[PDB]
Write a protein that binds this ligand. Structure first.
Ligand code: M25
Length: 119
């Protein structure tokens, strides 16, 4: 990551862009596994093997409360969603596939956001 991403505080204008990025991911057809926390009734061992769970509803709460101070912190929570999924599930599962697709989409949107901060 470049210096602006790591070190520039998130302004109010930056926060309007983060809200838009988040809503775009929540509207994607392959985001269904990630919208809410993993349900322990459907995966009884999940919370014993994933030490730092993350999901898009937790990220929305954090955006609304202005939790993030730097773009790097927002990117780290999003990346945790996809990394947790690829560690828990096998490479041939539909869950793993959805992580591949949605991370590519996130990177496209993140590049757009970064371009809009500066010019
Ligand atoms: C985001 C994410 O990784 N969700 C996985 C949810 C999930 C994984 C596995 C199963 S099982 N035990 O039926 O094979 C159920 C649900």
């Amino acid at each position: 990551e470049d210096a602006m991403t790591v070190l520039t505080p998130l302004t109010e204008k930056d926060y309007e862009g983060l809200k838009r990025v988040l809503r775009s991911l929540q509207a994607h057809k392959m985001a269904w596994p990630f919208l809410e926390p993993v349900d322990p009734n459907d995966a009884p061992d999940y919370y014993g093997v994933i030490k730092e769970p993350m999901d898009l509803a937790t990220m929305e709460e954090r955006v609304q409360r202005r939790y993030y101070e730097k773009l790097t912190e927002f990117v780290a929570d999003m990346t945790k969603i996809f990394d947790n999924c690829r560690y828990y599930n096998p490479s041939d599962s539909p869950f793993y596939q959805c992580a591949e697709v949605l991370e590519s989409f996130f990177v496209q949107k993140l590049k757009g956001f970064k371009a809009s901060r500066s010019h």
